[PDB]
């Protein structure tokens, strides 16, 4: 790629070739065309999965849910031409997006009839049937997570960041817990680094050592960050990270902070989060050895809206770790209130 | 305004200050904060309008519709704190957005109670009432267009093009037919020119004479294009524009094309349009005198989808004027079918 860049604070410009990593968070609510394999091959895969007892699909990200919403109508118009009594039903996502134990099979013969080329202009809509193949939603009672397929697609080509371009996907033959590397961008330049994908933007900086600076998550995935796209992967502990390894946190020294361990019990039920090292309004944290031990993350306001003023912790470094969500602040697992009992506060019930 | 631009065609990087006109089309589906006068002042204005015989609102553009969507909840929460038995209901726009004869009054007292500062975090939502103040739905039976207010606001401060900026509006004291000039940009450089706003992108080019090149419309407004934001407004007759004046067409020699008159009866019912001078697929146009006169715009495909092959115009110039919509092509009023009778085709039922 050829590009030009500018920084207005210093009034400098620069042009040339190289590798450019952009902030492409929330690049799913834009207009894109999606082509999941072929209309007939994908119908055959869904039919075979249904015959094999896989009830539905648990999504990996918001992008897969958007793709299923895009292709649902055509996938139902086909698979009715073939006499298959099956209907795809697509709902909304909830965080965190839990891992599923199954995978979609790769079909070998492909459904007959049907048509090619996702995006047929005119077709007759299909009638609803009695058997439903549920993509994510509030449907864990009708089929549990144990019978759901997860992480079955691989991106071949995309034009993310340019609207009205096509995304090409395929049903993978292998089995893996790894996130898709086709949309991951990592860079380091001097004393600043980024680990990014379509839903994460994780920043680190060079202080006395390298440390986490801030993170912006619009989703909580459960895939694993590939080591080929990770900086400084050697000689690291999986219990010294900040974002847990099971929440797609990179296994890097850029995902560490002195005095903090992995946040297994953070507020991972939110729609989107911001990880910051800064005190919340009206609160003050003190380092004292007589404070309590680690536990679930706590909200800085009570259920009635009262702000708790004094917090403690044993071996922190300041500023304290905090999560910014829609309903307010949450503190790290190491930070506990001084005088207020822990039973009087809103806590987190999610474990990674 | 300091800015740098690049032309990737050959190589042209340039920096400096000046006036920059950006392509801001579809700036309503982005995230912005909307601030009408004040919750109490706007509630007082709505109450006075309701007591004075104004039933509802016909919006000028999409942006006003989105603003009403944003402020509906707080406007209903206030105005029951003042005991007023009224409820605001917002619908979806339909094209074209017809002009309304009334305006919103400017109140001198401002409702008491309530609160300041649009954007209160927590409040009790208001219960529904019997009286409805409707904004652009399928509601012309419960009150007609003759009792609706139209073009009542004025933009005072905005940051369109940068997400999460605030837009500040105001109820106007006067009576006008002009579109809001705060979001209009016009520019000419060498042999190319632009007339643009939040819903219009109109291009003209220097041929042997200045002429219209192409236009992209996402809404069909009925306000008037101001002359302070128009190029070459003198010695121009309203009968020879392309986009009609009553559809917010600029009064410019840049809004003209040889052999064509004003398109009063085009397909103005469409959600989104593109205006191009190019033959549609499977059709050819021949200039000859024995062809018919002007009439309503005609679709190039019949109801069953058959493409009409051959067309004629009396005195038009190639390439022919055409409209591109979601349902297919339309020809200009000057282009008629050579052999197929005109009663067998789909036509436009809207007059500007």
């Amino acid at each position, epitope marked *: 790629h050829h590009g030009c860049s500018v920084d207005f604070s210093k009034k400098e410009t620069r042009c040339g070739t190289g590798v450019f990593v952009y902030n492409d968070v929330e690049a799913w609510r834009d207009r894109y065309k999606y082509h999941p394999d072929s209309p007939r091959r994908l119908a055959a895969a869904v039919k075979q999965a249904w015959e094999d007892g896989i009830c539905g699909i648990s999504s990996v990200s918001r992008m897969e849910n958007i793709m299923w919403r895009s292709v649902e109508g055509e996938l139902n118009a086909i698979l009715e031409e073939n006499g298959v009594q099956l209907t795809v039903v697509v709902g909304s996502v909830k965080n965190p997006m839990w891992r599923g134990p199954q995978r979609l099979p790769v079909p070998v013969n492909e459904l007959p009839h049907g048509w090619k080329a996702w995006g047929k202009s005119y077709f007759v809509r299909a009638a609803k049937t009695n058997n439903s193949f549920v993509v994510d939603g509030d449907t864990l009672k009708e089929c549990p997570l144990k019978h759901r397929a997860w992480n079955s697609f691989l991106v071949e080509d995309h034009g993310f960041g340019v609207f009205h371009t096509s995304v090409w996907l395929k049903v993978r033959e292998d089995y893996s817990l790894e996130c898709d590397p086709a949309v991951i961008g990592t860079a380091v330049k001097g004393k600043e680094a980024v680990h990014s994908d379509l839903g994460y933007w994780i920043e680190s900086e060079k202080n006395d050592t390298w440390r986490l600076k801030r993170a912006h998550l619009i989703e909580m995935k459960t895939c694993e960050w590939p080591k080929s796209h990770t900086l400084w992967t050697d000689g690291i502990e999986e219990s010294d990270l900040i974002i847990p390894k099971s929440l797609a946190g990179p296994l890097s020294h850029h995902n560490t902070r002195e005095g903090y361990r992995t946040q297994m019990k953070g507020p991972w039920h939110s729609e989107e989060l911001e990880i910051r090292f800064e005190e919340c309004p009206g609160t003050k944290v003190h380092v004292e050895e007589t404070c309590g031990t680690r536990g679930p993350s706590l909200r800085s306001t009570t259920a009635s809206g009262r702000v708790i003023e004094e917090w403690c912790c044993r071996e922190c470094t300041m500023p304290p770790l905090s999560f910014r969500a829609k309903d307010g602040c949450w503190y790290g697992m190491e930070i506990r209130p001084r005088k207020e009992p822990e039973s009087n506060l809103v806590r987190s019930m999610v474990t990674a | 305004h300091h800015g740098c631009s690049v032309d990737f065609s050959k190589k042209e990087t340039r920096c400096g200050t000046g006036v920059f006109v950006y392509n801001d089309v579809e700036a309503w589906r982005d995230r912005y904060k909307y601030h009408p006068d004040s919750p109490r002042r706007l509630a007082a204005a709505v109450k006075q309008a309701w007591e004075d015989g104004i039933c509802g609102i016909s919006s000028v553009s999409r942006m006003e519709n989105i603003m009403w969507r944003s402020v509906e909840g707080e406007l209903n929460a206030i105005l029951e704190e003042n005991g007023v038995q009224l409820t605001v209901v917002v619908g979806s726009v339909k094209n074209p957005m017809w002009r309304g004869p009334q305006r919103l009054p400017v109140p001198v007292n401002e409702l008491p109670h309530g609160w300041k500062a649009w954007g209160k975090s927590y409040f*009790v939502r208001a219960a529904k009432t019997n009286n409805s103040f409707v904004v652009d739905g399928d509601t012309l039976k419960e009150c007609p267009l003759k009792h609706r207010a139209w073009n009542s606001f004025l933009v005072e401060d905005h940051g369109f093009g940068v997400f999460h900026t605030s837009v500040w509006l105001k109820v106007r004291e006067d009576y006008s037919l002009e579109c809001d000039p705060a979001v209009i940009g016009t520019a000419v450089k060498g042999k190319e020119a632009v007339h643009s706003d939040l819903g219009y992108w109109i291009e003209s080019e220097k041929n042997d004479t200045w002429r219209l090149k192409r236009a992209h419309l996402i809404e069909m407004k009925t306000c008037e294009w101001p002359k302070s934001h128009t190029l070459w407004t003198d010695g121009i007759e309203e009968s020879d524009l392309i986009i009609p004046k009553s559809l917010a067409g600029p009064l410019s020699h840049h809004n003209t094309r040889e052999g064509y008159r004003t398109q009063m009866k085009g397909p103005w019912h469409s959600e989104e349009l593109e205006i191009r001078f190019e033959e549609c697929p499977g059709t050819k146009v021949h200039v000859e005198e024995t062809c018919g006169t002007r009439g309503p715009s005609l679709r190039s495909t019949t109801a069953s989808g058959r493409v009409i092959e051959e067309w004629c115009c009396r005195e038009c110039t190639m390439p022919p004027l055409s409209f591109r919509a979601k349902d297919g092509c339309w020809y200009g009023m000057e282009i008629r079918p050579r052999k197929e009778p005109e009663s067998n085709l789909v036509r436009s039922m809207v007059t500007a």
Partner: antibody
Amino acid sequence: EVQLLESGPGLVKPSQTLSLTCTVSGGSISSGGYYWSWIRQHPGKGLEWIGYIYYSGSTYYNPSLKSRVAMSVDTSKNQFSLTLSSVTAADTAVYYCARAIDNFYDNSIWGQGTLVTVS
Amino acid sequence: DIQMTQSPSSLSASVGDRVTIACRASQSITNFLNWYQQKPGKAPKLLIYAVSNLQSGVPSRFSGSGSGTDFTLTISSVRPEDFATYFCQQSYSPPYTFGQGTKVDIK
């Protein structure tokens, strides 16, 4: 425009389990800024607050009812319920369900109540 | 754990005069106090919240004031529909507690 309507058995024998259910109409029990509570009113006495529950899972229970209460949220039927074990004549009252706005105050709207007699 | 004390326990008034109810907290609750009204046979409904903020659809004759441990609820001009029982509730810290209630008889 939110209406609450709770039901349950009218009489319970002692030492068994009292089960109550509140059904929500005009709103969703999966919405963001709310939590759901229970309150009981003994005859010839004041009001007594039992506890709350969030849709995300966080709960609080009155320490007076020592390890005898439990609350759950049922999204499919759009309802939440209460369960009190080892009932006694002292557990006779009228039971109300309520929905409060979160982070604001205990600003609530209550149901119409159901009487439960233990004998 | 925070006891709420209400006085007087009951009172009678004529149509038009003024009525004063006092609630007392066993410890400093800043402004986390609510006032409830219960008609006979009906569930309580919230009249005032955060001490002074009145609800929508509430007659303006109701008012409240106070801070800390002492609070007051006043009815400027009694009307016959104001026959009910009034409670004070604190939301400073869970569990939330209520006063014993005050009855108003029309005289």
